[PDB]
Amino acid sequence: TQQIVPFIRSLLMPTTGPASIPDDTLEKHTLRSETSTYNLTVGDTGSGLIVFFPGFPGSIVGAHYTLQGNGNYKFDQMLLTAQNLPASYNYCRLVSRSLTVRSSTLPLNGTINAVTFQGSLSELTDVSYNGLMSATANINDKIGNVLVGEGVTVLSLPTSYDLGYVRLGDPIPAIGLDPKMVATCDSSDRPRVYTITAADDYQFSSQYQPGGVTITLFSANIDAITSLSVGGELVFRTSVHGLVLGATIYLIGFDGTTVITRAVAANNGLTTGTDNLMPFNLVIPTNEITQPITSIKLEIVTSKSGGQAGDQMSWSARGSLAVTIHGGNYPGALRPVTLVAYERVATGSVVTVAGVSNFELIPNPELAKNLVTEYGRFDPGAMNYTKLILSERDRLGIKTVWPTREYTDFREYFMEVADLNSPLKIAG
Amino acid sequence: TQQIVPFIRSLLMPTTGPASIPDDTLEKHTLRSETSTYNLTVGDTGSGLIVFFPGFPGSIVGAHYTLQGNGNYKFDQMLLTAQNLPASYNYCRLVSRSLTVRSSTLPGLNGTINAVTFQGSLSELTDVSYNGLMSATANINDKIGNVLVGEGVTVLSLPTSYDLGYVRLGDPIPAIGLDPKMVATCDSSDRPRVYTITAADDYQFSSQYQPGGVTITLFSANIDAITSLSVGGELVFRTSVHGLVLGATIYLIGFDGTTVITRAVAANNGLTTGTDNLMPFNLVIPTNEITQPITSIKLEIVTSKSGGQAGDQMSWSARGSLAVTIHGGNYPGALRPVTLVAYERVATGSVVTVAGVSNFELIPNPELAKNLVTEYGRFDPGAMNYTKLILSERDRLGIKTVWPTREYTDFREYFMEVADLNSPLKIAG
């Protein structure tokens, strides 16, 4: 520390403002802060979960779920940046981010457990208040039973530097006959791909039914916050004449709710002694994803034209599908997740979220006319200092989740120099 | 500056030759320069536009458009590297590049130049007129106005990110096939760009019967492509009317409004009542089909009926989104920064001369690799820090992406004041 190092200051105290990442990604950019402010209402059980995406390169900060009588979560709302970055910028990179979670009202209130998990949302094996505590072995990535009144601070720590600029989901110039037409340029670099072999000569056998017989061929945990696509093909064989197949893909939210439902093939006759192809050509736009996607499943309906008492409908199925979630493997886009769980909070009280997110940004064409961009400030040793700090993360006690009181202490313990500027004022 | 720093020299004075980028991308490579030389002819209006892709990792340097009586641009030709890199190399990275635009011959001084570097791809520019260019950036060192054509302009490529991966060039891959016109390449793929177009969300179509059908343009959207791309996704059609037949075509439109590529996506396609009718998109567009930069995509649909009469009212509902993936499209330099050089008031028939040097890190193809030694880059510490410092002070140093050539020449000699032979190595021991 001398004066200090703008980047370290920004990284460890994001509410302080942005600084350019001192890596090798030399783009002309501009630096911005976006606040997040939410007043969430506590449900009947007095318990709930905030899912944060600490590294998300853009306006999505997290999602809030209330816990219900029956032990299920129920989606409340997305937690966003104050304004929608893709409306003004085309490219983006996360510099630093911190969020504060505490109670503000009562109609004192319970406790908080928090973890930073090194995987995407659907990968967590246990998301209960208590179960959170073992999502990492890292002591500085979990905090237990912090009083809600005092609150918790979530600090975003890096998962890789020299990251590319991410395209935001920015609207692209387009005209179309449909009012509800939407055209964007999506986060794409570093896609995540899931491959699901749904069937390898899977035999299906069942008696006839008016209305048909529905099965769930598979269900698989995947993650998506933004646009994705499904490709691939199932091949069906049969000895039985006049079978008609229906198939639907469901994308399921964290709360078990159907987020998206897409008929992949409806009313589709099967021919005897031939391959019957069922292609998958799904594109799911960002705006359709009303809450984080947590799993994908495929249902198949089998029915017969004629039909009787005992008819026995049978088919064989083979094939694999590929689920590409665009930009999904970009560190921060899905990957690190910070869960903040609260319980025993009085029903009707307010859980207050306040955060600052800092970005390197490239303006969209209209803003670029009035927004000057520059290469980052050069200070050598900024990156080495960051590397040193992170290297000593555990001995320094630099947490991703803090009791706010402890984070406040840390701020003043660190940051003991901010020294005006000695004789520039008297120099010459 | 001590002696100097090969990379800085190469970056600021590309005509000087190549140097390895001093980042962390440690590959065994070889360093090469490729010249670009063009003598472009000025059209009737005395006005035109050169689109440069200053950061393009490969042989595509830009494109020339003439401006026409009716105010439209008309494509002239691609501006390329002297030789086709993908014929000899498989992987590539741009080190540095500069280009010069000026007039040489006058027919039996000519006008002015405006230039900008725009931080987006070609189709993203809101205004591409000679005058309108000047506001594409707010950055004073990324625009230059009313430079005399005789003196000319210098385009200097400034970085948009280091630690970039090697890009696969569009290199031919060994292949045999029954078709003479068969082409197999391995394309720039890393860092794709993806556009998502929701063309319809229960869009109702309604119209009276027509012999030959009724054609509509469902959507049109600005996209960018110079190299291979693909279109995926699906539209779903519903209808109450029997015997409707659908035709659908995708058009990829050039900067000059011209159709570059036209692909029937579904021709003659009967719609069944009370069911989803699927129209999949499985398009792959190879690089060699893209004769000029793609600027927009549109989809037309033809609706016709088997029978047909006077008043028949054909109706359908449509739902679905498409995804346009342009391979390696988000790789910084591949589409992103664009430098426009516009000229006007140049006498018709005069020559606008382009001369450039492009510098590359390259990996040879298998046949060349047998005779082309590759190495890790020369190590000099502080090269990257010095680059970072220079760029950090870009504006106070006045390091432009577009220069009046005279000012760039001055800068060269102002900078580069040491190139000092090599003092007593010659007398050492």
Next chain:
Amino acid sequence: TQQIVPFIRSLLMPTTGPASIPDDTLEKHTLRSETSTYNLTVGDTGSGLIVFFPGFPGSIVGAHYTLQGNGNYKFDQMLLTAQNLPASYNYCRLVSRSLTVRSSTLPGALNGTINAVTFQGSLSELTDVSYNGLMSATANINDKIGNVLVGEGVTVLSLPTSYDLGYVRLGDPIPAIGLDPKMVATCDSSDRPRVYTITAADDYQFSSQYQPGGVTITLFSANIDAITSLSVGGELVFRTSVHGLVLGATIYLIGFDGTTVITRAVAANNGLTTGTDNLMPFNLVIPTNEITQPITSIKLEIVTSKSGGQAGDQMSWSARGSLAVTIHGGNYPGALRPVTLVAYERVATGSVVTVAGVSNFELIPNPELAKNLVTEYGRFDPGAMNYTKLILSERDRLGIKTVWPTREYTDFREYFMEVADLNSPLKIAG
């Protein structure tokens, strides 16, 4: 060199253990070593080829092929890491790797030599893979070694092809339930895909007389590379003047040994209508587990038959379209790219060619292991990367090879690594 530099030590002497790569990719990770041990049996010809993927970010180390009487190679087995990384970890980055190849046992035989090269391309890109032909795959003298005695053996050392690489997703199983026992769901290496584009036809005219059973053609064949999952997309469009033509089409993915690895019917029994486009879409996804050996080429066959049929019937169609073969994470440096070939010949039939290696990784544990596996940011030492850059910059004058006569590598180890100095007065400090 002072003490030394853990990373350089790991890079140049991988059997020594792992160290964090001193680049800018700051992830909380853990460091691990995985051994590779194989005892390969020499075939009838006394000759064979080991294909190594020195930079592979994961458990695939290489593949062994024996050479046969007829001059063809025949796949033996994949060479892997001791345990399957994707079963325990989700993300991975290669730190360093070295492998040893030597004779250990013989029947009865005093012959046997190794030629080896590191080729800066993927397997299918090599123009000549014969024992002798290897020697010209690079011009780099420190990337080839010739006629090393098999008894002494060869050392393959993995040298970097780029730092600041992203973590690669391993082919890790993803939680899934399904009606099929043989159901498999993974999250694959995807970042940095490789894409091949094949224009299979541009108004290609087909013409042939009728045949019971049909007339099969190979429309195209193209060299591609795949070790892990890939997909095929695109479309062919067929036109015809002849009524009642039925088309069959199959894609074959062919192994290095000319053997069919994967065969997928793309369209079987498919009637063509007169005066219209007839679409043949490609919607293929090939999962990793189906790829039993490295894929070296792709070909498409088309069968043309007619419902009726007679003596002279002349079946004709026109075809247009291109396909795209995406191999997931294929362009990630190391995934396909550098290949080291170790060829042996004149080894006595029935003798053992022994492979021993160590691979070092930066790893992120899967959710179950993450509960008990502490992860950290890498040890900071400044000048580690500069020192690496210096070393590599002077690679040729230092004689740092990717393929060594083992005896020469051993000498190099002791020539380098002349300081490992205990730790002077910490023991007496205060």
Next chain:
Amino acid sequence: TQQIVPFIRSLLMPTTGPASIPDDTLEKHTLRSETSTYNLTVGDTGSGLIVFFPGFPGSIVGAHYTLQGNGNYKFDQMLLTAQNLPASYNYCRLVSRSLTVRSSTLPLNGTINAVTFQGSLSELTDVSYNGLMSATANINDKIGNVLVGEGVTVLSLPTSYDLGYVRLGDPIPAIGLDPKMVATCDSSDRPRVYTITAADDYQFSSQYQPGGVTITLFSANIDAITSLSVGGELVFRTSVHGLVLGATIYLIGFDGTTVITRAVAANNGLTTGTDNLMPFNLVIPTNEITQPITSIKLEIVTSKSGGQAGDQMSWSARGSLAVTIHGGNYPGALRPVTLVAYERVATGSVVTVAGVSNFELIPNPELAKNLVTEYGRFDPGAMNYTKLILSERDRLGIKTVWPTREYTDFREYFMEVADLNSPLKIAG
């Protein structure tokens, strides 16, 4: 640089005058400069090509070709030294050379592309204005789209030192009955040899023709500016009686034009069941070569004494030829070539060439009576300095082809000491 180094000065600024090459070739010699001055006229297409032989040890500097409507070149003239060195000197060595090409009149004018190619003229795969640019990979051996008004400077850079003295094509004392008798002593050291196996049991078969049937047995690219010879033998076998063979060798110029035509065997009966020899004993003197030779071809005429409708004439041929071009492999004699191409220059305008060539020379016997010769000035470190400079050629930007403006700048940037001579004038 101290004062400077005469040789480096001469090498980098040839217009400055000659200096002795500081190698080990210690001959008593004399130093001379010869200018080259040409005013070339631009043809109909406004386009043309100047071929320079930058290293030529003697009076041949280059050749000018105009480009024609049909895309062919047409030879204009040889570009020579001001006076014919072989008339006055017997031996010679090139020290340094520079030439300038620019427009001097109009009847504003076009552009120049230039390259130095490390091979002889006929070896260039592409000689078009645009194609030139890829003849080398060396950035300092090519220059693109230089304005003709400003012009280009060609600088000759070494291709080997410790070269022998070359015999010029000097006239030798001789008397003869023929007025047109010419006797010279030619550049011979380091011959270049081409070997052409024209036939290895090549079967010829064709129907009879009054006047015969002519074939071109082979055509091969070779290079010659000065004297050459053709040796070797073809052997013909046949089953057919009364066949008569004619054979002619053509040496073809760069412009596709026949430079030299020599009947090798005219009217030559073939005997059945025997080898029929056709020897090659050609000597081509320098003075017959009116423009650079670019290829050699051999035509054979086959005719029959009798002759009818269908007669079928057949022969088998075997043998190889050797083309020796005297002194051809002497570095500079054929080897490096610098091409200066211009286009878009107005028809009728003058392209002006001005150059200086510097030589080490040994006078002919008559001049030797009045021309003092000496061993070169000794300065140690001259050669090391040259080696250093050339070793750093690319970082110093020492080009073989320059935009003249850039070369002029270089001259004044270099050559910053030429310091009179401080107190010799005041010494003692």
